[PDB]
Chain A
Amino acid sequence: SSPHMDRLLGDLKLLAAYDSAAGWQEPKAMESAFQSLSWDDADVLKALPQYLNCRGEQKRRVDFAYAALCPRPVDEKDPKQTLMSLWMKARLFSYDQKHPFVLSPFAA
């Protein structure tokens, strides 16, 4: 009854697992993670092309959140990393366009 939260936390765990398996030289584990990285979400799939064409304040919010979560720059040559990054950004974009983010500590 909390699919958004559940899938967010799961994707984060899977990113961490991919990083750990890369550090420990484990192709089997990292491919297992990549396969388990929730690719069958219609909402994120529909938001993907919207994020690929967004611009301005919404894009800046989403990029700020994605830098908060995953600040390390992925290699511009690794399509798996690129795709996981795109998927996470699309998920954040969906969450934002449903209910925008409030990133400032000052708020009321």
Chain B
Amino acid sequence: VRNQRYPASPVQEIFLPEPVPFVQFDQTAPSPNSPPAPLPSPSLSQCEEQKDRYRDISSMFHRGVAGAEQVREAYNSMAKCFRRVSVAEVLESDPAFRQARNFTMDLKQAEDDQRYKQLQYGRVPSILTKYHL
């Protein structure tokens, strides 16, 4: 059942092994130099099908011919539609996120910065501090 990484294992592994993948981003496409455009602020005017389908499927489940997976799916879609407006309200109201919204920076400054010198993990205190010695 396993899909071998090296179908020609005795030969492929030697001169063309597989490297450790990189998951932060694709790394094969260009790097955007601009942030994403601010999506339109949402509202409850877009929960039509979500609400009505959730109602229908909940009724059909109370009957007993619907199931639970459909109920979960519909409820989660509707809840996402509501969380959209909740998060929009939070972002636009709370002040700590205004800087994050109007945050901008370039790869050149990223490479020129020098904060990477201080990314060293600390050291756990001594166990004698528990006894206060």
Contacts and interface: CB of A to CB of B under 8 A. Distances in A.
Interface string B77-97: 000100110110111001011
B36 interface: no
A79 interface: yes
A40 B80 contact: yes
Interface residues of A, number: 16
B36 to A, nearest CB: 15
A41 B84 CA distance: 9
B94 A25 contact: no
B90 A45 contact: yes
Interface stretch (B17-25, B105-113, B125-133): B17-25
B103 interface: no
A79 B23 CA distance: 11
Contact of B119 (A40, A41, A76): A76
A80 B24 contact: yes
B94 A27 contact: no
A49 B93 CA distance: 13
A40 B84 contact: yes
B83 A80 contact: no
A19 interface: no
A70 to B, nearest CB: 15
Interface in A17-54: 25, 27, 30-31, 40-42, 45-46, 49
A67 to B, nearest CB: 11
A9 to B, nearest CB: 14
B121 interface: yes
24 contacts: A25-B20, A27-B21, A27-B23, A30-B23, A40-B83, A40-B84, A40-B86, A40-B87, A41-B83, A42-B89, A45-B87, A45-B90, A46-B94, A49-B94, A49-B96, A49-B97, A73-B121, A76-B119, A76-B120, A76-B121, A77-B119, A79-B24, A80-B23, A80-B24
